[PDB]
Amino acid sequence: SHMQIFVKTLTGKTITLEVEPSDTIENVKAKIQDKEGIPPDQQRLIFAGKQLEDGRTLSDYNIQKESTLHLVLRLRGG
Amino acid sequence: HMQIFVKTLTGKTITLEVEPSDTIENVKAKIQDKEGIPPDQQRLIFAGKQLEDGRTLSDYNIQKESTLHLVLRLRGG
Amino acid sequence: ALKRIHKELNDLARDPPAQCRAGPVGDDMFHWQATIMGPNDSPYQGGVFFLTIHFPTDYPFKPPKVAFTTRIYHPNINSNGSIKLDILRSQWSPALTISKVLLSICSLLCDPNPDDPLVPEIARIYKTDREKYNRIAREWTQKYAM
Amino acid sequence: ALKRIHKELNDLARDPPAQCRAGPVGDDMFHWQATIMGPNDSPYQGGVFFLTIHFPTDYPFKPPKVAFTTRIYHPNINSNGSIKLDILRSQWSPALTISKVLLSICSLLCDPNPDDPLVPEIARIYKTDREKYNRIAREWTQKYAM
Amino acid sequence: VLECGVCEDVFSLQGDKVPRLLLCGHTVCHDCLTRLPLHGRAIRCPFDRQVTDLGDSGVWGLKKNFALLELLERLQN
Amino acid sequence: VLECGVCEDVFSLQGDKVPRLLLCGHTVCHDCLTRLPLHGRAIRCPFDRQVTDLGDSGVWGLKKNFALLELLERLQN
Ligand SMILES: [Zn+2]
Ligand SMILES: [Zn+2]
Ligand SMILES: [Zn+2]
Ligand SMILES: [Zn+2]
């Protein structure tokens, strides 16, 4: 129900997040904004080499306690 | 070239590199650089007396390792 | 409020400025007595003036009530010891400590504002005849503050 | 420039992300080789793709030149290994490290942009017939990256 | 550790005592900021009286001092 | 001590490595700030791409992180 995950921010420092399986990706990004001050629209979260889309939840990606997400900046292929 | 002290608003004591010829406004400029308070908001006290801009550290007989006290601009009414 | 009052007290006991001293009289943390030394090379030189300080409940976000208990001759200070000074009313800053306020009040002793006076007569003396102002201020200092 | 390149290297040796590896080939600090693992549950699953990195003299204030040396089937990556990606051009940030860039490139591997493609044909396959796209990408992965 | 220049309490990593920034560059704890007198929709820095305008989010719209927070958290370990 | 998130050098209390603030609340060393691309009197924060407009003073107009500087000087002593 209540778990902790890790996020590797842009500077390389590792932060800990208090989350729930039901939390959406945008809620996670909101927590990232609270701790690091980066707007969600500028955040791109990666898990297992794959981008995490906003609409889905941590359960949808089977993200479990003490998993580590990687934060990069929003990007566009062209 | 000498060093003096200034007790800032927060109470922390800072050291300033000054000369006898330096005016009070120049001292306040150094205070602004280190602490970020505009000179027009600074009021410097030495021996219980306000230090006026035009005068110099020599005029007030301020000597090395003396301590000035920083308060906020005020007005009697 | 109480925590900051204690911090200011610890600082005043450990390393106060040479010009002033302050501390709670009796057991009340919200009522202090203060002492100011008249600045040198001034009509108040050599004087010792006492003051009362009363801290509001939400100090430091409201200013303290400061009043002179020693009679003093000044345009901006009346016979009852009331001080009309902007940092005690609408120009107060929560970062100002009692020590800063007392130093401020000394600098006011030697730098009065006759244009907007609390005691009009004293201000008239100050503007018209400064020698007389200094004489009377020195007399008051000797009689009441020594 | 060199100090930060060394910092990124120390970080990559001590605690690299599970997905990628990078380091200077030979003695040249400004020319690196990189390795990316194809993400799981994707046509590139099980693949190992190599890349070249060239650091400009005023890195990190100018982006690095990153190119695939392993042939890969992707709309935004061409046969010469060039990557059309905005963070390598006008959306570069001096705070981005090589590790972050490589993770970015993986996330691009599984989330292409067919609307504005570097290889129009591959994009046509991706939009019209996804099954064929996945088949061809898997074949390319087996032949060239295994 | 570092304390707030107003209440002189210790800064916390989150909550009522989190260090927030004013436009003048000075830092004040969240709680003290909420208790400062509101000049229309602006507050005055206690150290220089410089004005910071507040938005609809009020004190929560003021940015945290992220660098200070990183250093403090490092000191915690 | 604490390092700059771009060059990853240690912050200095003054000079080319002094910590300065952007409107987003993040801190960057003076020298790195001078090297950021300037698009019409504006720079983008490296951590969030948010814009800070520069005045006549340029990068020197960006406020120092005074609280961080106080903590760093405390650690130095
Ligand atoms: Zn506070
Ligand atoms: Zn300020
Ligand atoms: Zn920023
Ligand atoms: Zn830097």
How many angstroms separate the Cα of D98 from the Cα of each of C130, D94, F16? 76, 11, 26
The dihedral built from the CA positions of residue E28, E32, E34 and E36, taken in this order, carries a sign that is: negative
CB distance F7–D61 less than 8 Å?
no
State which H helix or E strand residue E34 sits in. helix E30-34
Which class for A29: exposed (0-12), middle (13-18), buried (19 or more C-beta within 10 A)?
A: buried
Are D24 and D10 a contacting pair, CB within 8 Å? no
Residue E63 DSSP label: P
Contacts of E73 (CB under 8 A, 6+ apart): E13
CB distance F5–D7 less than 8 Å?
no
Technique behind the model: X-ray
Distance CA B27, CA B32 (A): 9
State which H helix or E strand residue C3 sits in. helix C2-14
Distance CA D67, CA D17 (A): 20
Distance CA C89, CA D87 (A): 55
Are A9 and A44 a contacting pair, CB within 8 Å? no
Residue for token pair 């080789």: D33
The total of other beta-carbon atoms located within 10 Å of residue A62's CB is 10
How many angstroms separate the Cα of D57 from the Cα of each of A70, C78, D2, D92? 28, 72, 9, 16
Distance CA A26, CA E2 (A): 33
The ligand placed nearest to the CA atom of residue C4 is 1
**Neighbours, chain D (3 or more CB pairs < 8 A):** A, F
φ/ψ (deg, to 5) at D14: -75, -50
The total of other beta-carbon atoms located within 10 Å of residue F53's CB is 10
Distance CA D138, CA D133 (A): 9
The number of distinct structural domains making up chain E is 1
CA E68 to chain centre: 11
Residue for token pair 């030149």: D65
The total of other beta-carbon atoms located within 10 Å of residue E60's CB is 12
CB distance F66–B12 less than 8 Å?
no
Nearest 5 degrees, angle CA B59-CA B63-CA B69? 85
Q: To one decimal place, what's the resolution in Å?
A: 2.3
Spacing, Cα E28 to ligand 3 middle (Å): 19
Residue D95 sits in which domain range? 1-146
Distance CA E44, CA E24 (A): 10
* Contact residues on chain C for E6, CB-CB shorter than 8 A: 4, 60, 94-95
Contacts of D91 (CB under 8 A, 6+ apart): A73, A74, A75, A76, F49
Distance CA A12, CA D100 (A): 9
Q: Is residue C79 classed as helix, strand or coil in its secondary structure?
A: coil
Residue A43 sits in which domain range? 1-78
Residue for token pair 């920083």: B70
Residue for token pair 């591997």: D109
Residue F13 DSSP label: S
Distance CA F72, CA F77 (A): 9
- Give the environment of ion ligand 3: residues with CB less than 5 A: F 24, 26, 45, 47-48
Q: Is residue E29 classed as helix, strand or coil in its secondary structure?
A: strand
Chain E from 51 to 70: CB within 8 A of any C CB: none
Contacts of B31 (CB under 8 A, 6+ apart): B6, B8, B14, B16, B37, B39, B42, B70
Interchain CB contact of B35 with E (< 8 Å): yes
The number of distinct structural domains making up chain C is 1
- Quick one: three-class SS letters along chain D? CHHHHHHHHHHHHHCCCCCEEEEECCCCCCEEEEEEECCCCCCCCCCEEEEEEECCCCCCCCCCEEEECCCCCECCECCCCEECEHHHCCCCCCCCCHHHHHHHHHHHHHCCCCCCCCCHHHHHHHHHCHHHHHHHHHHHHHHHHC
Spacing, Cα D85 to ligand 2 middle (Å): 42
Are C65 and C54 a contacting pair, CB within 8 Å? yes
Residue F66 sits in which domain range? 1-77
Distance CA D1, CA D54 (A): 13
Are D74 and D109 a contacting pair, CB within 8 Å? yes
Task: Quote the radius of gyration of chain D (alpha carbons, Å).
Answer: 15
The two structure tokens encoding residue C120: 């009009």
Interchain CB contact of A30 with E (< 8 Å): no
Residue A38 DSSP label: -
Using alpha carbons, select from D135, F27, C128 the residue that is nearest to residue A11.
F27
Residue for token pair 């400004």: D30
* Contact residues on chain A for E63, CB-CB shorter than 8 A: 37
Spacing, Cα C3 to ligand 1 middle (Å): 11
Distance CA B63, CA B20 (A): 8
Distance CA F72, CA A36 (A): 21
Q: Which amino acid is at D100?
A: K
The number of distinct structural domains making up chain B is 1
Distance CA D33, CA D28 (A): 11
Strand (E) positions, F1-76? 19-21, 27-29, 42-44, 51-53
Spacing, Cα F61 to ligand 2 middle (Å): 14
Using alpha carbons, select from C4, F60, C76 the residue that is nearest to residue E5.
C4
Distance CA B18, CA B26 (A): 9
The total of other beta-carbon atoms located within 10 Å of residue E37's CB is 11
By C-alpha distance, the chain C residue nearest E37 is C61
State which H helix or E strand residue C131 sits in. helix C130-144
Q: Is residue E2 classed as helix, strand or coil in its secondary structure?
A: coil
CB distance D106–A50 less than 8 Å?
yes
The ligand placed nearest to the CA atom of residue B36 is 2
- Quick one: three-class SS letters along chain B? CEEEEEECCCCCEEEEEECCCCEHHHHHHHHHHHHCCCHHHEEEEECCEECCCCCECCCCCCCCCCEEEEEECCCEC
Residue for token pair 């969030």: F48
